[PDB]
Nucleic acid binder design. Structure first.
Ligand SMILES: [Mg+2]
Ligand SMILES: [Mg+2]
Lengths: 172, 177
DNA sequence: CTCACACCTT
DNA sequence: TAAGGTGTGAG
């Protein structure tokens, strides 16, 4: 647990964070943008670990976007326990995980409470916090939370500034 | 370090074999056994926050029948679980390691409108208590003892749990044979 | 599922 | 002490 985790593309995340990050969620499931990726150090090279993500409510509010601003508009909806996204390389050695960027870019977000594909179910107009968890594969694990990756789940982009950012930052 | 050891593990296992139930009430109910741990491997001078939460063990709703728990439906959706921060937090590693860390005063309630800061559970659902350890100068670590999982109930279902509670909890001494 | 209650601990 | 944690058992 003397492990360090570093958010990749932090500057891009910050730009989105300043505006107020939104992530589109759909029936088919949508990848996050920015992608969530991390560098990890301090793992035992030979020990096996499972790396995984979840995405948990950031608060108890429900939100609306109006007058180019977000604001609380109600009580957050109750939900089922969040699904986990287990990194596909799991389980793997500390040396494997440390050798290059651990990317969670294939993680998908859906708004379909009946989703059959294992995608992470969110509710529109709620705020969420992505978390990374590191488990010795072998009762104990550690969790890393970057506040700048927090976001509001949306059904289509609300703040037109976000749309510009996404447009300006994806080659194709 | 960091290592966390469950106190009275033997007693927990006795309940766990039968299938642990924890009473929940409006006023808030202590767990029995008391959740207590020994911790080692902390930096003696560093300050830490210790806290617990209690999370759904699965997505099921249960029923008890034929002297057996069995799945009966989908679990009820719920709000995020409240935290119980240990009263001594924040404290130094040395403080935490000096004696058992007790979470005896943690209370469980069924009142979704509870104003007392107690942990809100739904009856007939299964739950897993977890201990978290947060350091000082984002990152924290979590310890999960599966032998402490339990089904929240409004009154005891399996009479073997009732008898265990009576035999081992001092406050129930008056009901003993 | 709830409450007044006897009986007990701390 | 006095305050407060138990399961009870009828409703
Ligand atoms: Mg990206
Ligand atoms: Mg104990």
């Amino acid at each position: 647990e003397g492990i360090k985790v570093f958010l990749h593309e932090r500057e891009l995340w910050l730009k989105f964070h300043e505006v107020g990050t939104e992530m589109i969620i759909t029936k088919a499931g949508r990848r996050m943008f920015p992608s969530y990726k991390v560098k990890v150090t301090g793992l035992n090279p030979k020990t096996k670990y499972i790396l995984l993500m979840d995405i948990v409510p950031a608060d108890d509010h429900r939100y609306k976007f109006a007058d180019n601003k977000w604001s609380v508009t109600g009580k957050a909806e109750p939900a089922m326990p969040g699904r986990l996204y287990v990194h596909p390389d799991s389980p793997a050695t500390g040396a494997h995980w440390m050798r290059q960027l651990v990317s969670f870019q294939k993680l998908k977000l859906t708004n379909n409470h009946l989703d059959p594909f294992g995608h992470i179910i969110l509710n529109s107009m709620h705020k969420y916090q992505p978390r990374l968890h590191i488990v010795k594969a072998d009762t104990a694990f550690c969790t890393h939370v970057f506040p700048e990756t927090a976001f509001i789940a949306v059904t289509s982009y609300q703040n037109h500034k976000i749309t510009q950012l996404k447009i300006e930052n994806n080659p194709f």
